Design a protein around this ligand. Structure first.
Ligand SMILES: [Zn+2]
Ligand SMILES: [Zn+2]
Ligand SMILES: [Zn+2]
Lengths: 47, 50, 50, 30, 67, 1095, 50, 50, 10
């Protein structure tokens, strides 16, 4: 479907992981990635 | 962790709980308050009479 | 309210309703409402200058 | 009657266990 | 973290004077003088600004930045 | 009046800047990887084979580089500590050595040969985190306030606790159930520890050792050592009428036995000793360097050994018949051990093992060879050393067979609960004594320790003195040499022991010199000796860490120079006056004349525990007399780190002080500058931390005002309706709604997944859609399209976090999706996906939960007063006094006399005065501010002078008769909330071995009912209830038994008698039948006898 | 009902009341030392003079 | 109890016949005197006394 | 063999 967008922790590049590939970054040499925030609707109480 | 004084003497039982106590001078001498969450877990079986 | 940095965004929609101050402290219409008894200072004997 | 010690001969029971709470943070079932 | 919007005891809004208090501490003013000129009268809503640490500023240096 | 200098309080920061609090843990490692690493290298440098003497190995030099990581292939990049802490890696650096091996006929020198890795400290000299700036510390995602000093092994922080032990190379004289006994423990640089003891019974001395079978008279050992004439023996023993009458039995016993020559004595020793080469040779080698290893022998001369044994005999003679014994609780002799010496032993053992292993692999390949050249680089591995180090650090079980020692519980997980608990863990010191109830002396407070170990800082419970903490001013001496010391001693005019005879040592004027448990010689005029030695030490030629004392009871001078001693800086006085003046401190305030320059100008000096025994120290300057030798810098330094947070410690009582020291590490607060980046198992945060009004100088020394773990709140000490029970305290509903005491909990959930030896892998299903709508199923609701949960969502009870499918053996997969277990609904913060060192996928998730204070929470007053919440009082209550201020937390005045805490009222008063004026008041120990200048300042504003205010009750609406104590107080919130300390179980899982509820509240288990409560049920006389809740609701089983032959049958049928008539059934708990069927394997058949209960 | 710092306070006439007692105690204590030195304190019960 | 950090536990009888044995022997109103001395152990708390 | 982004239908 849509490529799963991931962000790095050193350069913060929005890349994508295709399938069973070495998990890394294409801009820097950092080997840890993070995830984006969900685009759903969450309910919070201000009490 | 044996069987003489570990299982026979211990013999831990179910249908129980433990919680921090709080003061409440609004009851009698033989009364105690039970939380709703704990009362929902505990069950007492009884036979139905007429 | 909050602090932001380059690469940050905050967007929300809040609902304002009617309530009384007994439910929550945010429904208090007055910041401070207090009273004081009137003082009284009564002398007994003529006092000296010093 | 031999000169023995109560501690090594008599093994520690639930009597000996002093139930006291301290901060100590940081099998087949069917 | 951040200055509370309202007081804890009475509930007076003291979150609208933190920047004013910061700007008043660099104009050759005394702590008590600045706190009395801000508008605080008693010690009910005066300890919220006097004894208050600012850690969100130190937490923004570790915040993710875009490049 | 005396000239006073109120400026010596700035010497303590200058002294702490160079070393002190936590820097010594790093100096112990920096000196270790620069000296001891080379010491063990020069220890084992040459190894040779046994097949043919042509092959040999040599070592040129060894060193350690910078922290590096070996990735996929031929890529070495600098790694960060946070990177290893997030990837669960290990912070280590390789060890580069220069080796030389002779293969074939020529010699090869291969430089830069890697042999293994080694862990590196967080704040070491070789690490990256050193000499940086806070702006650069923020770029590496590391807290600049982190003191460090721990090890990172597999993504956890491990700290090695300092352990205290008894000193070696010394003579101890103790008393036991029979009488007095002397002992000597010796341990040299090589691997041989010995413990000899001289015992006395019916006026006959005997020597006992581990290799000796029976006891041998000391006179026999004397004759065997080399002294032949019996007169010289008694001459060496002592020249006194009463020491000769006690040595008569030994002389007549030696005369009785046919032993008059050295050969006969050695033959007797050989016959007596048993070892599993004639008897004379083994008896001679047993006396040379076996019993006493700390006394070297040049060729075969036992003169020094004879002198030492004679001094020991004189000591045990002077001890017997008197009321003088030596105790082990004295801290002047007890030494400390850091993480350096343990690592030294471990590395030495590992290096010797590695040298002995490769020696054995290349000895059976040279004879049975097929080539002409043999390279040792190909037959080499670097995994054993790294694996051994990592396992020894992680497990913490130091097992050294070469040293023959086994220790457990040395390394512990660094507690990251708060900022004080993390620093206080580095100052914790554990003892070698086990959990013994009988011992009370070592646990009891000793008069020896003064300003070295904080008395108040100690855990409450079982360990009531076994765990101790260091003081603010404390330094551990490192290892040094003795060449220049003995040279200066010989130049002073010390006489050699080989010149004088045995009758001179008994002379009172004669004095003996002891240096690290070694007799240096005989000297006269010991006073001038000590004076000149102290002058030379103050000069700068000899190092400053050299202790020298004198003993008049024993008439000998002790010179201590071994590493691991306790010393704190002291100011020198000059006969009526301190050398430190105002002009010397003005320069320190300017920026010059630091602690080093003061030590080089003969202004201050270090003293040991035994060194301060022979000197007079004055507390203040008005107490300085003509006999005082040293002056205390600051008297508030005696308190510890956890004890420096208590306002007015002298005002409070010692039990309350200990309680507050124990609860200071329990209070939750801010951890550091990077708490959202780090992902630990359990983490607690506060919402709005306040600043303590009445702070301490120790607080500013550690900068605790930047990460406080508490909040200021208005307290009114008065009784309330019905919920002011001894420790119950009430809260304000309005303040709790405004946000007083809001806390957050953070839990970690980590999932690792890797490959196998075959082509079998793993995979994640992901979301599950139904046929009705295009929405995920209730089971996998938080699951995203990829297969992991999305951050910023809410997870309820019994919800799948990540889908994990594992192959059972095209292959059939079994679904094992991790399920979140919790009572409340948590929230997702972030998700991290990375690779481990074994090429395995690791997914970490941080779950947050915000909580509010409720009935059943534990709060503290930072004054040793812990209490549970009472009832939540609304805002219509909590009467105001004059302005409209409502009490935030009502305190009970009935617990004050029992606890006897006066510092709380003074704390409240000073806090009120400070918040009114607008400046923080100092409340340091043995000083601070008085109650007279603060009471007159509270009047200028317009309030009452001490504490009183007019309060009008809000419940009824009438003024109160008595006045109420109002003021701001610093409170703190602790752990053990009511939400977590609450569980119940009715019918859940059981065990398969014995049918009973499982242990623990996380596995849905029940509670245990022991004999403690069973005796109470028996005392009442109720038996039906006892069997109902030990047999009916615990384990109920039906078993069939035969009456003729008691045995266990089945379906009412016996297999022994082959008869269905005699049969019955009973209710027997599963435990009883379990024991009955388990006892049958011990050749025991329990035969029951069934009797008629009706008749 | 409440307690404050004013309840527990040294009295005016109390400071000099205990001062004289402490002075007399010290004046009686520093004499027994020289009494033991020169030889005094005839002891009735069987024990050590120390 | 100290009412500061105490954790007290609770049990629920399952058999109805044993429910009557804990009401007559293990009764709060019945057990008010102590067997050792013979004095009432349940009188009051310091607050009620004051 | 790693197989991700799976969507089963029922
Ligand atoms: Zn990147
Ligand atoms: Zn206020
Ligand atoms: Zn049978």
């Amino acid at each position: 479907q849509q490529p799963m967008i991931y962000i790095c922790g050193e350069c913060h590049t929005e890349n994508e992981i295709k399938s069973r590939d070495p998990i890394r970054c294409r801009e820097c040499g950092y080997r840890i990635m993070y995830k984006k925030r969900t685009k759903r609707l969450v309910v919070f109480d201000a009490r | 962790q044996g069987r003489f004084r570990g299982n026979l003497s211990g013999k831990r039982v179910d249908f129980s709980g433990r919680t921090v106590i709080s003061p409440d001078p609004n009851l009698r001498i033989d009364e105690v308050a039970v939380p709703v969450h704990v009362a929902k877990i505990l069950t007492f079986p009884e036979k139905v009479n007429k | 309210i909050a602090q932001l940095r380059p690469g940050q965004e905050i967007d929300l929609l809040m609902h304002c309703v009617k309530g009384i101050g007994k439910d929550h402290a945010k429904f208090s219409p007055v910041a401070t409402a207090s009273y004081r008894l009137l003082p009284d200072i009564t002398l007994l004997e003529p006092v000296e200058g010093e | 009657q031999e000169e023995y010690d109560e501690e090594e001969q008599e093994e520690e029971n639930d009597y000996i266990n002093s139930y006291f709470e301290d901060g100590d943070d940081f099998e087949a079932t069917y | 973290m951040i200055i509370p919007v309202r007081c804890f005891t009475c509930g007076k809004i003291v979150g609208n004077k933190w920047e004013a208090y910061l700007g008043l501490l660099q104009a050759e003013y005394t702590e008590g003088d600045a706190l009395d000129a801000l508008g605080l009268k008693r010690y009910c809503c005066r300890r919220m600004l006097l004894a208050h640490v600012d850690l969100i500023e130190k937490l923004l240096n570790y915040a993710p930045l875009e490049k | 009046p005396i000239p006073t200098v109120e400026e010596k309080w700035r010497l303590l920061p200058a002294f702490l800047k160079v070393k002190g609090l936590v820097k010594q843990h790093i100096d112990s490692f920096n000196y270790f990887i620069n000296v001891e690493i080379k010491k063990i290298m020069k220890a084992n440098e040459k190894v040779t084979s046994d097949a043919d003497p042509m092959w040999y190995l040599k070592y040129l030099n060894i060193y350690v580089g910078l922290p590096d990581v070996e990735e996929s292939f031929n890529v070495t990049r600098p790694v960060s500590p946070h990177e290893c802490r997030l990837r669960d890696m290990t912070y280590s650096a390789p060890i580069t050595v220069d080796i030389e091996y002779t293969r074939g006929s020529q010699r090869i020198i291969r430089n830069a040969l890697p042999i293994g890795r080694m862990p590196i400290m967080l704040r070491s000299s070789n690490c990256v985190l050193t000499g940086k700036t806070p702006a650069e510390f923020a770029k590496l995602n590391e807290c600049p306030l982190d003191p460090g000093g721990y090890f990172i092994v597999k993504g956890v922080e491990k700290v090695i606790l300092i352990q205290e032990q008894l000193s070696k190379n010394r003579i101890i004289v103790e008393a036991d159930r029979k009488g007095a006994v002397g002992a000597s423990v010796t341990s040299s640089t090589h691997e041989k520890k010995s413990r000899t003891n001289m015992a006395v019974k019916q006026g006959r001395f005997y020597l006992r050792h581990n290799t000796l079978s029976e006891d041998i008279p000391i006179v026999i050992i004397f004759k065997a050592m080399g002294v032949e004439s019996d007169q010289e023996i008694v001459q060496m023993i002592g020249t006194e009428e009463h020491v000769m009458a006690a040595f008569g039995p030994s002389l007549e016993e030696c005369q009785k036995a046919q032993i008059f020559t050295q050969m006969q004595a050695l033959k007797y020793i050989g016959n007596k000793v048993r070892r599993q080469k004639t008897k004379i040779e083994e008896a001679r080698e047993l006396l040379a360097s076996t019993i006493l290893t700390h006394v070297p022998v040049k060729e075969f001369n036992f003169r020094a050994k004879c002198i030492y044994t004679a001094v020991m005999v004189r000591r045990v003679i002077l001890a017997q018949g008197d009321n003088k014994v030596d105790d082990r609780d004295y801290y002047g002799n007890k030494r400390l051990e850091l993480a350096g010496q343990l690592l030294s032993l471990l590395f030495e053992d590992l290096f010797k093992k590695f040298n002995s292993e490769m020696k054995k692999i290349a000895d059976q390949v040279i004879p049975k060879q097929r080539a002409a050249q043999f390279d040792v680089v190909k037959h080499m591995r670097q995994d054993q050393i790294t694996n051994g180090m990592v396992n020894a650090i992680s497990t913490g079980n130091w097992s050294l067979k070469r040293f023959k020692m086994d220790r457990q519980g040395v390394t512990q997980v660094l507690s990251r609960l708060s900022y004080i608990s993390a620093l206080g863990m580095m100052t914790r010191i554990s003892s070698q004594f086990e959990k013994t109830r009988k011992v009370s002396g070592p646990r009891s407070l000793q008069p020896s320790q003064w300003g070295m170990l904080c008395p108040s800082d100690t855990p409450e419970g079982e360990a009531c003195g076994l765990v101790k903490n260091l003081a603010l001013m404390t330094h551990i001496t490192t290892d040094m040499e003795d060449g220049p010391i003995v040279k200066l001693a010989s130049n002073l005019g010390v006489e050699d022991v080989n010149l004088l005879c045995g009758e001179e040592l008994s002379y009172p004027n004669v004095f003996l010199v002891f240096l690290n448990g070694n007799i240096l010689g005989v000297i006269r005029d010991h006073k001038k000796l000590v004076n000149t030695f102290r002058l030379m030490r103050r000069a700068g030629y000899i190092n400053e860490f050299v202790s020298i004392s004198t003993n008049l009871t024993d008439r000998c001078v002790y010179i201590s120079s071994d590493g691991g001693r306790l010393c704190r800086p002291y100011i020198i006085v000059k006969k009526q006056k301190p050398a430190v003046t105002n002009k010397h401190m003005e320069e320190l305030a300017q920026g010059y004349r630091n602690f080093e320059d003061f030590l080089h100008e003969s202004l201050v000096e270090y003293l040991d525990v035994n060194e301060e025994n022979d000197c007079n120290i004055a507390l203040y300057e008005h107490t300085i007399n003509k006999d005082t030798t040293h002056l205390e810098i600051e008297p508030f330094t005696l308190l510890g780190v956890c004890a420096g947070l208590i306002p007015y410690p002298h005002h409070n009582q010692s039990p309350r002080n200990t309680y507050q020291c124990a609860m200071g590490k329990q209070a939750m607060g801010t951890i550091g500058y990077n708490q959202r980046n780090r992902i630990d198992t359990l983490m607690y945060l506060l919402a709005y931390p306040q600043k303590p009004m009445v702070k301490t100088k120790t607080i500013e020394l550690i900068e605790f005002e930047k990460l406080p773990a508490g909040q200021n709140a208005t307290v009114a000490v008065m009784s309330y309706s019905g919920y002011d029970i001894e420790d119950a305290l009430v809260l304000n509903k309005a303040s709790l709604d405004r946000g007083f005491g809001r806390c957050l909990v953070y839990k970690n959930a980590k999932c690792t997944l890797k490959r196998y030896t075959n082509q079998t892998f793993d995979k994640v299903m992901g979301p599950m859609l139904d046929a009705a709508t295009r929405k995920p199923i209730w089971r996998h609701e938080i699951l995203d399209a990829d297969g992991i949960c999305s951050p910023g969502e809410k997870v309820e009870n019994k919800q799948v976090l990540v889908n994990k499918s594992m192959p059972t053996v095209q292959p059939q997969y079994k679904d094992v999706p991790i399920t979140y277990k919790g009572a409340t609904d948590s929230y997702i913060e972030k998700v991290m996906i990375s690779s481990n060192a074994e090429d395995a996928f690791l997914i970490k998730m941080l779950l947050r939960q915000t909580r509010r204070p409720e009935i059943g929470d534990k709060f503290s007053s930072r004054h040793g007063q812990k209490g549970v919440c009472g009832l939540i009082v609304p805002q219509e209550d909590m009467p105001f006094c004059d302005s409209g201020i409502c009490p935030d937390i009502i305190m009970n005045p009935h617990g004050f006399p029992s606890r006897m805490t006066v510092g709380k009222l003074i704390e409240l008063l000073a806090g009120k005065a400070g918040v009114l004026d607008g400046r923080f008041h100092y409340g340091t120990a043995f000083g601070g501010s008085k109650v007279k200048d603060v009471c007159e300042d509270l009047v200028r504003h317009g309030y009452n002078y001490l504490g009183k205010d007019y309060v009008t009750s809000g419940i009824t609406g009438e003024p109160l008769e008595a006045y109420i104590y109002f003021g701001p107080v610093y409170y703190q919130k602790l752990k053990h909330m009511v939400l977590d300390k609450m569980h119940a179980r009715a019918r859940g899982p059981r065990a398969v071995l014995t049918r009973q509820p499982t242990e623990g509240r996380s596995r849905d288990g029940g509670l245990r009912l022991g004999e403690m409560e069973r005796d109470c049920l028996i005392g009442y006389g109720a038996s039906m209830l006892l069997l109902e809740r030990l047999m009916i609701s615990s384990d109920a089983f039906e078993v069939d038994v035969c009456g003729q032959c008691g045995l266990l049958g089945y379906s009412g049928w016996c297999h022994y008698c082959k008869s269905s008539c005699h049969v019955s059934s009973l209710r027997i708990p599963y435990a009883c039948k379990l024991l009955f069927q388990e006892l049958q394997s011990m050749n025991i058949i329990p035969r029951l006898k069934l009797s008629k209960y009706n008749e | 009902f409440s307690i404050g710092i004013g309840d527990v306070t040294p009295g005016q006439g109390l400071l000099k009341a205990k001062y004289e007692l402490l002075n007399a105690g010290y004046k009686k204590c520093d004499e027994y030392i020289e009494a033991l030195n020169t030889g005094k304190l005839q002891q009735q019960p069987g024990c050590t003079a120390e | 109890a100290d009412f500061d950090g105490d954790e007290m536990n609770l049990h629920l009888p399952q058999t109805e016949e044993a429910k009557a044995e804990a009401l007559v022997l293990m009764g709060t109103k019945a057990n008010l005197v102590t067997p050792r001395n013979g004095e009432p152990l349940i009188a009051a708390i310091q607050d009620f006394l004051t | 063999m790693w197989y991700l982004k799976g969507t089963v239908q029922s």
